[PDB]
Amino acid sequence: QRVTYRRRLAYNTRSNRTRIIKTPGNNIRYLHIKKLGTIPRCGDTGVPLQGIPALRPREFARLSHNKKTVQRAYGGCLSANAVKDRIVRAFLIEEQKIVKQKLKQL
Amino acid sequence: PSHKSFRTKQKLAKAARQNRPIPQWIRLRTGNTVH
Amino acid sequence: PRQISDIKQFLEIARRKDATSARIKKNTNKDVKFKLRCSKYLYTLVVADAKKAEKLRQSLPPDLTVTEVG
Amino acid sequence: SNKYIIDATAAVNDKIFDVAAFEKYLIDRIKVDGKTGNLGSSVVVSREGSSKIAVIAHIDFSGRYLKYLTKKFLKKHSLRDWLRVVSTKKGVYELRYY
RNA sequence: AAUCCGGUUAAUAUUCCGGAACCAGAAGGUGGAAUCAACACGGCAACGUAAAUGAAGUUGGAGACGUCGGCGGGAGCCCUGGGAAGAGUUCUCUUUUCUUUUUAACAAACCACACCCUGAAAUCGGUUUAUCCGGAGCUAGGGUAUGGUGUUUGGAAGAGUUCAGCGAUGCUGAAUCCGGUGCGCUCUCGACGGCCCUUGAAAAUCCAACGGAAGUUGUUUUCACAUCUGGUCGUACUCCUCCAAGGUGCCUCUAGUUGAUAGAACAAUGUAGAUAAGGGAAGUCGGCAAAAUGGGAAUUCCCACUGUCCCUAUCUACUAUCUA
């Protein structure tokens, strides 16, 4: 059967996304589904982080703290490799500065 | 249309209700006119 | 709607002041569906043992309004 | 295995069709694998009493066939106005008047 | 930020009725969790969990982003085997012909691409429909997360539909099943591969990080549960854009019309469409239109063709005519 849109927002667009379902009354119906969520992305590299559910921005508030962050430094903001790269670079830079200061003082 | 301001509802109603038969007893009180 | 398998829990939810009414459903597979209406969720318990259903029935507090097959 | 019973009590009472007739016609029209009388051991049409048409089959045998076959002699005698076939229960079919 | 199903009107429905949910904010309370070792533990790791304070200041993410092609997944629709129900057809043939066979939002447990660990590889392996990656660590083994989905329920049969009946429209029976699928169509998701060059809006809004201020009675808790509230305006009806069955440009199902001032006669006229003996462009400034299939050779010639012509004749519908 030909089905019409539930709303009156003519000229269906990106927002107008529907799904066809069969009701217990044996009727085919348009069900408007909101856009899928987006998983957070790493700040340094940009790959989506691991262990964070892919949900909507407004929805993220409902989650608990542990479900939005990872138990590590910069957890929920930087990937594990990015954290590793950040840590080793900082230490090598500090050592490069400590030897440079040692060379200048002698 | 449908998404119409409320003033329009009053504006439309008054314009339409002007087109209304003048009561019989109205005439009996001497004189009353159209338009 | 929440499906509860723990009978005791169904008793505790019933003893909760939120519960308003309970319904007993007799299915063709001889299961009794105890549907307890609460504020937010309709808690259902499917019991396979017939005598368990009856011994469940009067263990429900008398103040709660139990109802026959819907 | 599966059992199909065609009631004939109403036919016997009203003399529309006698039991020997359901006997003779079911034998010579049971197109078991397309052949009459091919019932063999898999299908056994053993009507008990002068009111019943019972079939014991070891294979699927659609009751829609029996309704179609019962309609055969029904049309031939032209009492379709006075008599039709319905399903009282799964595998059980009986004869209704107006 | 957040709604679904069934029912209901003479006319309104994601709004109303019945049932079932969800979101946002608000306070206390109850229970659980952490601390005089000051703000939890576990795993090599990716990371996990019922919780597990974080000021100023400093950042990060979502929102938020081109286009094209192929592949994979799911749903609906279409096709179809049986099962059941009814209506057919039936001298005979015909397990046959036609029609129907439902599960919503939401809530539960489980169910596969990136990364980690062992590893050190070419005799090159793995692998796409399309050769892509690999000492910047392959194949292989064990893990982690993302779950597109599927499984089992709950919702939920009490609803809806279809058959039988029996008696305000009620009551009682049953069934509403098991498959198979395909370069199928519609919609969506995942994984790639190009072309880009034009390397591909902004903001509200929400989250996280770094940072370490402060702090027996207490302190914290983004954990669980109960409690409350959600205004204003649009919504009737009519119609650039949406939905779009099957079979072989036609036919049909679903659905929608039978209206457009009518009737009677059918001469001449006109338009349109045809057929025509013999000839075959002799017609006209001329193969204009038809039929031929149009063809061949250099506008011309040859061949073919025909009512263009000699020479018109016949038929049909409409027009035309009369009547209201």
Domain ranges (residues) in chain A: 1-36, 37-105
C1' (E228) to CA (C40) span, angstroms: 14
Cα dist from A69 to A61, A66, D91, whole Å = 12, 5, 64
Closest by Cα among C3, C58, C63, C62 to C36? C3
CA dihedral D64, D67, D71, D72 (to 10 degrees): 70
Where do we find the tokens 């507090």? C61
Q: Are strands D52-57 and D84-89 parallel, antiparallel or unpaired?
A: unpaired
Q: Which bases of strand E have any atom within 7 Å of the beta carbon of a protein residue?
A: 1-7, 14, 19-25, 40-43, 45-54, 59-65, 75-77, 82-96, 101-108, 114-116, 144-148, 153-161, 163-165, 174-175, 186-190, 204-211, 222-228, 233-238, 240-244
DSSP annotation of D50: G
For residue D45, count other CB atoms closer than 10 A to its CB. 18
Q: Are strands C65-67 and A28-32 parallel, antiparallel or unpaired?
A: unpaired
Cβ–Cβ under 8 Å, residues C19 and C64? yes
Q: Quick one: residue A5, left, alpha or beta (phi over 0 = left, psi -120 to 50 = alpha)?
A: beta
Closest nt by CA–C1' to A7: E14
Q: How many CA atoms lie within 13 A of D67 on its CB side?
A: 14
For residues A80 and A44, give the distance between their C-alpha atoms in angstroms, rounded to a whole number: 11
| Declared resolution, Å | 2.8
Q: Are strands D84-89 and D92-96 parallel, antiparallel or unpaired?
A: antiparallel
For residues A17 and A14, give the distance between their C-alpha atoms in angstroms, rounded to a whole number: 7
Against chain C, the chains showing at least 3 CB pairs within 8 Å are none
Cβ–Cβ under 8 Å, residues D63 and D91? yes
Q: Which of residues 17-76 of A touch strand E (CB under 7 A)?
A: 17-29, 31-32, 34-43, 46-47, 49-62, 64-76
Judged by DSSP in three states, D35 sits in: strand
Where do we find the tokens 């929805």? A59
For CA atoms D37, D41, D44, D49, the dihedral sign is: positive
For residues D67 and D29, give the distance between their C-alpha atoms in angstroms, rounded to a whole number: 12
> Which residues does residue D7 pair with via DSSP β-bridges, in sequence order?
D52
**Residue-wise over D56-94: b if at least 16 C-beta within 10 A, else e?**
ebeeebebeebeebbeebbeeeebeeebbbeeeeebebb
For residues D73 and B31, give the distance between their C-alpha atoms in angstroms, rounded to a whole number: 90
Q: Which of residues 49-68 of C touch strand E (CB under 7 A)?
A: none
**Contact flag, residue D75 CB and nucleic strand E, below 7 A:** yes
For residues D14 and D21, give the distance between their C-alpha atoms in angstroms, rounded to a whole number: 14
For residue C65, count other CB atoms closer than 10 A to its CB. 12
For residues A84 and C62, give the distance between their C-alpha atoms in angstroms, rounded to a whole number: 64
Closest by Cα among A77, A100, A81, A101 to A89? A81
**Contact flag, residue A86 CB and nucleic strand E, below 7 A:** no
Query: Six-digit token pair at A50?
Result: 């691991």
For residues A77 and A69, give the distance between their C-alpha atoms in angstroms, rounded to a whole number: 8
Cβ–Cβ under 8 Å, residues D1 and D58? yes
For residues D83 and D98, give the distance between their C-alpha atoms in angstroms, rounded to a whole number: 7
Strands (E), B1-35: none
**Contact flag, residue D36 CB and nucleic strand E, below 7 A:** no
Against chain B, the chains showing at least 3 CB pairs within 8 Å are none
**Contact flag, residue A82 CB and nucleic strand E, below 7 A:** no
**Residue-wise over C23-58: b if at least 16 C-beta within 10 A, else e?**
bbeeeeeeebbbbbbeeeeebbbbbeeeeebeebee
Q: From which experimental method does this structure derive? A: cryo-EM
